[PDB]
Write a protein that binds this ligand. Structure first.
Ligand SMILES: [Mg+2]
Ligand SMILES: [Mg+2]
Ligand SMILES: [Mg+2]
Ligand SMILES: [Mg+2]
Ligand SMILES: [Mn+2]
Ligand SMILES: [Mn+2]
Ligand SMILES: [Mn+2]
Ligand SMILES: [Mn+2]
Ligand SMILES: [Mn+2]
Ligand SMILES: [Mn+2]
Ligand SMILES: [Mn+2]
Ligand SMILES: [Mn+2]
Ligand code: NA
Ligand code: NA
Ligand code: NA
Ligand code: NA
Ligand code: NA
Ligand code: NA
Ligand code: NA
Ligand code: NA
Lengths: 387, 387, 387, 387
């Protein structure tokens, strides 16, 4: 049951199942995986595709001949399996040169290098067929207040993204960018810390249509925010270009648990929203099998990501299709929420005594919302406990 | 020392010093204050002005004659003291009718009433000379996932703000709106939970120039965010129309401590930013004297808000003016952060071997940022411990 | 299905279903309930009993004749329904006199009054058959560092609890005390903020056997802690005298959602633990139907508390009984965790070369824990998705 | 000014200034330091001593001859500088063998090895003169609910600490143990997550007098707790055997900022408490110079730890010595908090009409606490802004 197929568009970063287990306090617990291995194993589980940072696919500092051979082997694995590469990204965080940032490093020479490193990988992403190019500015930020003038940093961040937009336009590429917010870690505070901040920033770019967000479940939850709500705002803005799925237990370091772990009910409401809205992008997992696991546990954890999505999809669909739930949604006036407040226009509203002088506030206030019965129907559907 | 004067533009909500002390678990500990009392006492402390919700000034349900008398007494107090009213707002949260929201209530009749209540108070705000009209949508949100379709709610929120913009335009008013984000409380999750989400929303309004943000120190800190960083993004966007100053100890219920309490170093960096950027708006305190206090403690707490701002202003100015700090800022390359990455343009960057093939990443990575010495100079300045 | 019976020992505070909906920002949305109404309605839902603060049952300041009549009516309702009263507590938080605390108020006269108020209610609790007397010191704490010397406050808190222990001993009562931790709210920080702090404090009382903890799901989660882990430590100490069940979404104000809401997987692991350990006390709900609800929603929310416990009980039992899970637990060495490390004793351990010189650390480190497969079996059982 | 001397008992872990800068997302930014270098540089800054994990001083897997040479060089550096070694600890977290724990690993063979590794290092600690042996069980815990039976794990943790107590007793050593709590990171949840949980656990050990706590500023703040309050409870229990000083910005990953950074006012109240209580142990810094820094920044950050302690010590002493503050403390009834509630005894309290029938609750409730004026005096003293 719940068997994923490539139809489901489940994708995984090479760095997810390939995470060797080094953490702030601990050495690696697993050997490095050859990307070819990961492609073949993920395909066997029913994944649709993989994603990569430049330096996951091509060791940093590789010669041109080494680069070609790494890409050739990877492409053979993709061809052997039918796996796709819908998204790629740049590693602008691991190498010590990026310790104060890539695009917003105080040192101008580093900012220029970061751009050149990204541009090289955009070309590769396009060659591999990627539709989306993600940017996670994990080093953009500060541990202290004097270290980073945020207005200046936002100017530099806009300059960088504008140059990248000029680049893809000039090359006729169809790829689009997706900015991945995170509130903190590894920097004390990261610039563009939430979906909202990233959406707002995009509106100030020179070609805003080329940029959207890549929200990650656990990152919004590191600020204690409601991930489904943030996804709804991104969808409302037309900016949900990609998504990172995982689990998180609240306000902690970024745990990258398998999807469905962490906040299970938020996972349910997320899947309900994505499916109801017809989100058509990859269902991408940015997760880490815990370092307690051997490779069998790696593949079990990856399989669990997809399984949990599919269980939740089934339960959310059953919730929405249940005539009792539809009745409860009407009892709670969800239908009214979807209707304009004043399609009659401002003057009609101002002239409408039913909206003021003759509005019976106490009668209105007496009406219960019936939200608890609705939510218990949702719980019963999630748990398969209807009756 | 540190004596406030009206020049400093310190303002207070009537509901701040007037908070009677009722909390989720406790009855009022102080009697209600007459707004006239608050105006006169705040003036004696050196405040510049006050702000109000409609229902702080005019008891809910007042007749037209009662409304006129309350306003007349208030205006006499303002005239007697020289106090100004730079901002007003609507109470769309206390009355039970607003239990599921004002502008985004599921019930359409409530949404219409909320708009009419706001419009009535915009007229009053203009009559009292207010430049800014704040909206804190404290009831907009949900405790459960099925209760609120966030895309539909954002449609309703946009409709409401668009109607208000049409209203002020049609009346020729110069007032502008400032949306106040909060992540949660009293709703389980509040819509537009951070400065970023509010900034992003504004960009989708029909007349975006009429709307900005009213960020509150403690509200961003309830999501664990960096308040100075968020203010910097608002300033970068040209949207810091007003600000609410207070203190908060991290991820808790909204404490509304006096300004300077809570995160003291964030208060320092905030004042540094506001003063450096030349923010010209009110320095408004949205705080609550703790319910442990009698009225002498109320006025002590209000005086402390202003005193702490002025101490921090002095220390931040001394930091920025210190030649040793200026040297440290250059050592940390803050000057370079402010210079364009690639004013030479994209093609020149692509052709620049110093940005890629000839960039010595290891030499760059070896350079220390000297951020710790800079931050210790900042600490020494804050504490008045230079030497 | 999942129909509660009095056998299940589900209990509710009068103040739960009776919460009128006043919050930090909002007036009551529901009328007050007569305790008799609540007893009868809860009995109809299959509850076993109720609990009370003194001032929930007897209006503060009642005359002796009024007190007798309130108790008489309540006892008739209990007799009419078969409902029990297993626990009672004192309200040492609502009245303004308790604004700085009850037992740890700085004012000695208030501390003495708090003790007398508690003692009066202990007598009533015993008359009603209560086995446990809870103490939630919600006002014990501070908003500022100078206001409360915590060592002195702990001396006063110990003195108070020691006097209460002397009292019940002197009267020959069998009741025992259960201290309810909370980290913050309504005080900026509350004394004894977690299960651990309360357990540690109890060990320093003169008659430690008379005192245990009353942990509340949401309170530990307000510190981001693992509630099942804390319950395990309380059970390990022999101190889980009572429990408060509800839901919470992380680090926020105390939401008191119905049980099962909030962190659903933590609710699953909690029920698994309570049932596996044979916890024999009340399954008490300290929750608040949201203020959006009318009375039908109140009773739906209360019914949902019990329903969710029973669903989770079924799923946890099925998990533990599944031979595949039992195999996975052995694969993950849960059996070994339960066996002594060194029943052979210290000298044998020191002499055992297999524990040091001949321990193959790399072979040990290569063994995977298989925790992800175990956790996915747990997820499948919770969701009823085995297959 | 504020120049540290060995008199001040400032100590640093080798792993603090020696942290190479590897984080969850980034490679090392600094070369490894020879412990001899760190001892000499710290001495030059005015430190009193250093501390070590076994594997900071002796590379893991060293031969007996290598071990002797590393220790000999270290002891020469200590002798050359006058630096002391007051505390040592075991690394039971870095090596992959400890991925599920040391003392509470599910695998019994690992638990036995962890004990043997600790015992070997206790012998070395004693030889170097350490008074305290710290245990930070960073790997004790879980990412999933089924992986770790917490009651069984607590049994294993007690067994381990009891064996260590038997060991030191049998050898006649005067060293004592200090358990360091942390709520999470690197495990999803760590056992003994707070000072309270550790204090409670200690009470159940066979020789409780041999064990205390080593609380760390940032670790309690990762649960949003009040660090000074927790230190007060540890002092009240007689269990503050050692302390780790650093800074943290709230509920995040463990930042290990220099002391004084993070929550500055909590740092002030901590120093006030330690000095007022006469804490006589090391003022130990467990911090990490940010990876942005070169070695000059490492030493600046270490110097800043000590400087900030000394500034705060001065300001707290001035606060306590100020006759205006002493008056404010009396106005706020801090003197009364320190006096017994009922030294007259239970019967006298029960017979005292002034404690009940004749207690004027409304007159008591009208008295203000004057906590805000007290706290503003504290702020003025911290900032050196009295006047
Ligand atoms: Mg629709
Ligand atoms: Mg500039
Ligand atoms: Mg067992
Ligand atoms: Mg004393
Ligand atoms: Mn992540
Ligand atoms: Mn991601
Ligand atoms: Mn607030
Ligand atoms: Mn505000
Ligand atoms: Mn609660
Ligand atoms: Mn409770
Ligand atoms: Mn730490
Ligand atoms: Mn430490
Ligand atoms: Na700039
Ligand atoms: Na979209
Ligand atoms: Na709509
Ligand atoms: Na602005
Ligand atoms: Na005392
Ligand atoms: Na127990
Ligand atoms: Na056991
Ligand atoms: Na002590």
């Amino acid at each position: 049951n719940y068997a994923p197929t490539p139809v489901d568009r489940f994708t995984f970063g090479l760095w997810t199942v390939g995470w060797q287990g080094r953490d702030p306090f601990g050495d690696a617990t697993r050997r490095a995986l050859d990307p070819v291995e990961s492609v073949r194993r993920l395909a066997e589980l029913g994944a649709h595709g993989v994603t990569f940072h430049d330096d996951d696919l091509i060791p940093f500092g590789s010669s041109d001949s080494e680069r070609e051979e790494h890409v050739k082997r990877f492409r053979q694995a993709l061809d052997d399996t039918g796996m796709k590469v819908p998204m790629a990204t740049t590693n602008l965080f691991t190498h010590p040169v990026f310790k104060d940032g890539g695009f917003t490093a105080n040192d101008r020479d580093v900012r220029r290098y970061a751009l050149r490193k990204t541009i090289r990988n955009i070309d590769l992403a396009v060659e591999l067929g990627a539709e989306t190019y993600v940017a996670w500015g994990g080093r953009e930020g500060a541990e202290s207040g004097g270290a980073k003038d945020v207005r200046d940093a936002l100017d530099r961040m806009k300059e960088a993204f504008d140059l990248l937009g000029e680049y893809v336009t000039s090359q006729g590429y169809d790829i689009r960018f997706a900015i991945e917010p995170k509130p903190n870690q590894p920097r004390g505070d990261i610039l563009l810390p939430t979906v909202g901040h990233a959406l707002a920033f995009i509106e100030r770019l020179e070609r805003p249509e080329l940029y959207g967000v890549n929200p990650e479940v656990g990152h919004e939850q590191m600020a204690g925010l409601n991930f489904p709500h943030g996804i709804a705002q991104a969808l409302w803005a037309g900016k949900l270009f990609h998504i990172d799925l995982n689990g998180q237990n609240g306000i902690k370091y970024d745990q990258d648990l398998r999807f469905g772990a962490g906040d299970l009910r938020a996972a349910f409401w997320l899947v309900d929203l994505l499916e109801s809205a017809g989100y058509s992008g990859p269902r991408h997992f940015d997760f880490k099998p815990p370092r307690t696991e051997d490779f069998d546990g790696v593949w079990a954890s990856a399989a669990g990501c997809m399984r949990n999505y599919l269980i939740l999809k089934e339960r959310a669909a059953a919730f929405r299709a249940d005539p009792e739930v539809q009745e409860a949604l009407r009892a709670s006036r969800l239908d009214e929420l979807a209707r304009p407040t004043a399609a009659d226009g401002l003057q009609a509203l101002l002239d409408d005594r039913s909206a003021f002088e003759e509005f019976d506030v106490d009668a209105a206030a007496a009406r219960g919302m019936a939200f608890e019965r609705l939510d218990q129907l949702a719980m019963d559907h999630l748990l398969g406990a209807r009756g």
